[PDB]
Design a binder for this molecule. Structure first.
Ligand SMILES: NC(=O)c1ccc[n+]([C@@H]2O[C@H](COP(=O)([O-])OP(=O)(O)OC[C@H]3O[C@@H](n4cnc5c(N)ncnc54)[C@H](O)[C@@H]3O)[C@@H](O)[C@H]2O)c1
Ligand SMILES: NC(=O)c1ccc[n+]([C@@H]2O[C@H](COP(=O)([O-])OP(=O)(O)OC[C@H]3O[C@@H](n4cnc5c(N)ncnc54)[C@H](O)[C@@H]3O)[C@@H](O)[C@H]2O)c1
Ligand SMILES: NC(=O)c1ccc[n+]([C@@H]2O[C@H](COP(=O)([O-])OP(=O)(O)OC[C@H]3O[C@@H](n4cnc5c(N)ncnc54)[C@H](O)[C@@H]3O)[C@@H](O)[C@H]2O)c1
Ligand SMILES: NC(=O)c1ccc[n+]([C@@H]2O[C@H](COP(=O)([O-])OP(=O)(O)OC[C@H]3O[C@@H](n4cnc5c(N)ncnc54)[C@H](O)[C@@H]3O)[C@@H](O)[C@H]2O)c1
Ligand SMILES: [Cl-]
Lengths: 342, 342, 339, 339
């Protein structure tokens, strides 16, 4: 029927490889013709196992050489602004993973380049908005079935088994810290659910569970309490040392009923009875938890390019969530309350 | 204020010791004066730990020597009829544990002796009727909150840790088989909930989990299906080899809703997170599960003796439950459907 | 080179299968569609881009250039459609059950057996379900010891009653055991590696007394004796208030597993005046959607690679004979010995 | 030989303590009762068999032959009722909290210390609860590793709003943190062995704007920095739809425990048009009935043997200070340092 979109991908790591698989196997109206990474094994895997034509170690070279309509940026956070700016100037439609970046000026310039190319689609990586459970809860809230929102609590905690791959991820490039890396999703959800902005942050951090993270300037746990512009209160917890699995939980406490999303991170529909009692095995990664969400958001992006429609989640939503996460980290660093400026 | 009832107990085993503890510590308007057991150490325990005045190895000696208003028979099932008859004839009020007996001839004579002493209270031991949860579900059903009952499922499975204490219990005396020992409780519950009687039984037995039980003529598992007098269908499962704990479960499946009682045998209100996932520790015995019900039923008996009122659960209820149980056992042994007449 | 495929039937499950074929399945193109409904065919042509539509399935097989056919028409037509396609060289995916008439199913199996270069696959999708596979891996590893007892539930929500009544008046459903429990029967055989030797069936119409007029039963409860000493219970029903209950309990000598104990819709827990609430799934389609996609993908891959599926025609016959033995037991009011 | 006992207060909790004293507690006789309500006093004399009833507690103490007294009167009377009883050479069980005014509690604590032959026990019943003790056992054994974070919830159902509104118009509750989270603070102090050094509190009246008219807050949320690096959250509330939520999460370095994640009424699972439902507890009393019994039994035992309870007066004072810091933090819109 219609000519499929020609696409390229930067990054083939923890999330990169999942996006690449979906891009080849699951996404309609797209052909992944080029891949870029600094790891030679990942590039060989992209070529031989996935059937991607051309591989690159230089992303600028790829954009300069390849005939592509859209690009997927799944490289580390510090590279996001420069990679996006380069692709936007080349005339490309951009899907960039969260966060937008780390430096405020680098993000602002990125935002300026995006706004100057309105004919090109820019989409961020807040996948939890596409997840069926979060949507279902949002629909309940929008219906008035829990009254007015009083309080929201967000958990985002990786399991102990993920300490090796996170360390590599954080050693090789700045992640922005626990609040920026873990809590940013929850920050967007709170903004989405309430329609309000945080005006004050109290952040506390911890290395009790993993003291060796101090060596690389990381905190194992980040706990933040937020005050919103409308009176709603919030707690955010990011962590890396859960024993059961990947905990991703959102609690929305209303004036007339509550909802809890992902109270237990159940793997499947199987209840196990053993010498421990009654067990529910848990999901061990964010990727297995949000696999469908990752697929649906990317399909949405491809559809956005074809139709010529910008995503509901704006650049400003990415900036605001980043500034808030930074504020929580600032609060912990300085040991003071931080009034959020947006 | 008023003279307490003077009571005695026969048997201080798995259930006897719990009854004796409640009788000294929890039950009001009663004083445990004497105890009878064949175990010397159990009798010493009654004197030294509980403060019981006198001890006996012969129950007839105790009944003919002690000044008592009431007796508690927690001796093995075969001794129930002869102990009840002797105690009834001595003017005593009798609380006898379930079941009434094993031989239909012995139980008939026992029932006749109880009928001939209408001024003396007799009470069986179907404690589940006193349990808070079963009562709650019975109220739900009676209010019509599940519509009309169509199906019921009763599970009564001991944990693997109880295998040693059961073998002791079943080698020293005839327990009456798995359907009589385990499933009798659910039979009573089904009769209670429906107001109907079973007309047909299909029973099947298993020694897969423990083949050594055949050496004492016992079956590890007994599964029975029942046709009720007004349409209802029921399944009963008695077992002795669960890994998680003591499973005691009742499902009432209606035309406009269901209820499940004790779907999981949760020990307490603690949820555990470990390398297994999300865990709920389980109850390990019938005595821990039904501790309150055991207390409440004995208190009801004591009140019944004082006020001069026969309990709701009649002798007829015990006979029928025993008959239906033995019909399930017969069905399994003869490999045929058994039509029940009550 | 993608497979050229046709579909017969665009109903409750037919529309779902056709969607997957177009949107999710790799190595295939849905070239043609056949149904008796004009609206369903227009939906297939407009919304799914199906090139050609037919009311006559035989005319479709004889006109279209196709490699595979998906049979999602009513059960009675399964044998003759499978037979016609097999004799025309096609690869066949046929939905459960194989059929109702034992002779037609034997004739059906004969046509399958005489075309060994052609793939035939049935629709036991629960074997592809992530949860069932997980439990099957647990049992195989010896994590629950030996199986002693299994319990299978298949109960539809009240909302489906008015839908089912209209269908069961005009057509033969095969009965409550055949319709609601055949999946559970296959699962028991799969998990145990053994066959039922005896069956006790009971039926009920307490929840829907109006079904007695159309020779149907609202509830069927069956107790089964396995060849190795394992005991099973099957329940089929049509009057659950909470939603679609599909449950398997596998009781072992050293551990139990339960599959779909509660038919949880998603990961949202609700707190309201009723207490603490988990919303439930309302149809088999929503529950086993991924399974429906995976089995169909498996079939496509089987045709391409030229490999017959694990589940045989014999598996489909046996599960049907077992289900019918349960219905017979209830109807004659007697124990039925199975072989 | 039983201890002769009296009770002051027969309201929401007093009525419960009185019943346990008569029906369940061993080694104690409830001889006298004092309240400002005729109906309550008459209920004590008729349904419980209490000999003498009073409307003045001073008259009761000065007349009755008693060894112990239970103070379940309103909080403003706690300091003066304890001092009056301690001076009378009496063993005192006093409900939470010790008081609302720091000067009155300071004087109260000084009197308690000067009578060391008399037992003083407070009302932190959660330390007697089976579930909290089981979780405390896990934490102590090192079965969750090192504590990193803890979260305490105490939320009353909407049904309880009416009785609270009329009460808080009449008397000072001490604020949402003092009234709803004091148990949780003690629990955190008990589980960690550490003390908070800093508090950030925020309040809300979104659910009940009418409470701002009487200087009350419907919801309070606090974050606490503990002295050795542990982080904690406290939430008190009065507008839950499902029932009484009382929950404690202990997040560790190698495992977590959650106590009372759902406030389950019993062991019954309900299946209806809304899905799978667990009915919830509606009050703190029904949730902690056994805890109330066991602590009062422990007090009686303490008086018999002559052993002071593990929970000290400094525990009740510290917990109160911490809760007040949370309230103050919200009221002034600033962080509060705690010493
Ligand atoms: N949405 C989510 O829940 C989610 C989850 C995980 C990661 N992410 C984001 O996705 C991005 C990638 O995360 P990850 O975990 O896959 O990282 P990773 O460490 O696993 O992999 C990084 C990849 O980027 C490539 N790369 C690094 N520098 C490059 C360079 N300058 N030029 C070209 N390629 C380069 C590497 O070869 C590697 O394949 C991060 O920005 C992260 O914030 C989002
Ligand atoms: N209500 C229930 O849920 C329930 C549960 C378990 C047992 N029971 C019933 O309780 C009875 C005993 O149960 P148990 O598990 O404690 O058995 P047990 O073997 O543990 O204890 C039996 C006790 O009776 C004493 N005894 C045996 N023969 C005696 C004799 N002839 N004269 C005097 N004393 C004698 C023994 O010394 C022993 O202490 C059984 O009849 C059983 O059916 C009921
Ligand atoms: N795997 C499962 O759990 C499962 C679930 C539901 C149904 N099924 C099976 O799928 C089949 C269809 O089920 P359904 O619920 O979709 O039925 P349905 O009534 O909803 O749909 C039947 C479809 O077949 C078409 N059709 C009927 N007769 C035809 C004919 N002679 N020629 C061509 N087309 C014809 C109709 O137009 C209709 O579109 C049944 O055989 C059933 O056994 C399996
Ligand atoms: N342990 C807990 O979790 C918990 C829970 C609720 C209440 N409490 C505490 O218990 C105390 C009472 O609580 P409540 O809810 O039962 O109060 P309430 O209002 O329901 O009852 C007060 C009772 O005290 C009596 N009373 C009032 N003034 C008196 C006076 N000056 N002299 C003699 N009697 C007097 C009244 O007659 C009434 O019976 C409070 O101080 C409260 O802080 C503790
Ligand atoms: Cl938004």
């Amino acid at each position: 029927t219609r000519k499929p979109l020609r696409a390229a991908i930067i990054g083939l790591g923890r999330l990169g490889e999942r996006h690449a698989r979906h891009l080849v196997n699951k996404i309609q109206g797209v052909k992944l013709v080029a891949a870029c990474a600094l790891d030679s094994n990942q590039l060989e895997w992209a070529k031989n196992e996935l059937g991607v034509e051309t591989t690159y170690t230089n992303y600028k070279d790829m954009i300069d050489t390849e005939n592509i309509d859209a690009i997927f940026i799944v490289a580390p956070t510090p590279f996001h602004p420069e990679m996006t700016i380069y692709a936007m100037n080349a005339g490309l439609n951009v899907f960039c993973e969260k966060p937008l970046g780390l430096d405020f000026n680098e993000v602002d310039e990125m935002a300026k380049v995006i706004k100057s190319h309105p004919n090109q689609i820019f989409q961020s990586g807040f996948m939890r908005r596409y997840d069926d459970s979060y949507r279902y809860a949002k629909k309940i809230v929008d219906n008035g079935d829990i009254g007015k929102i009083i309080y929201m609590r967000g958990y985002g905690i990786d399991p102990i088994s993920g300490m090796e791959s996170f360390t590599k991820f954080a050693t090789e490039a700045d992640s922005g810290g626990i609040f920026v890396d873990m809590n940013i999703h929850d920050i967007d959800l709170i903004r989405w659910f309430t329609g309000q902005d945080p005006v004050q942050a109290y952040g506390l951090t911890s290395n009790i569970a993993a003291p060796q993270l101090a060596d690389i300037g990381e905190f194992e746990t980040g706990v933040a309490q937020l005050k919103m512009s409308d009176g709603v209160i919030a707690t955010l917890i990011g962590g890396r040392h859960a024993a059961h699995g990947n905990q991703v939980e959102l609690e929305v406490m209303g004036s007339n009923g509550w909802v809890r999303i992902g109270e237990h991170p159940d793997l499947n529909r199987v209840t196990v009875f053993n010498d421990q009692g009654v067990v529910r095995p848990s999901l061990q990664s964010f990727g297995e938890r949000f696999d469908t969400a990752f697929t649906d958001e990317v399909q949405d992006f491809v559809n956005n390019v074809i139709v010529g429609k910008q995503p509901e989640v704006t650049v400003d939503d990415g900036i605001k969530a980043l500034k808030i996460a930074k504020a929580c980290q600032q609060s912990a660093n300085i040991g003071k309350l931080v009034d959020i400026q947006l």
